[PDB]
Design a protein around this nucleic acid. Structure first.
Length: 79
DNA sequence: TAGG
């Protein structure tokens, strides 16, 4: 498996760029930006799985990430 | 920064 846990994202990052940024990274598997309209916790972050393990191999090495407008700390994600 |  290969996932990257992005930490600290804008008020609503569009998986679309995340798809480009990370897509351009390589083969993105999926992008899940969790949002709570009931309490809006401080999770304000996004998860990204790569079909491949390269974007993942590099992502984890990247202290911080910048997606279009959003910029969050990506540490290999865990599901 | 932690979804589901």
């Amino acid at each position: 498996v290969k996932k990257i846990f992005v930490g600290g994202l804008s008020p609503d990052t569009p998986e679309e760029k995340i798809r480009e940024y990370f897509g351009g990274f390589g083969e993105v598997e999926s992008i899940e930006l969790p949002m709570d309209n009931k309490t809006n916790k401080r999770r304000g972050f996004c998860f990204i799985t790569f079909k491949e393990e390269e974007p993942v191999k590099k992502i984890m090495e990247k202290k911080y990430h910048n997606v279009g407008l959003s910029k969050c700390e990506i540490k290999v994600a865990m599901s």
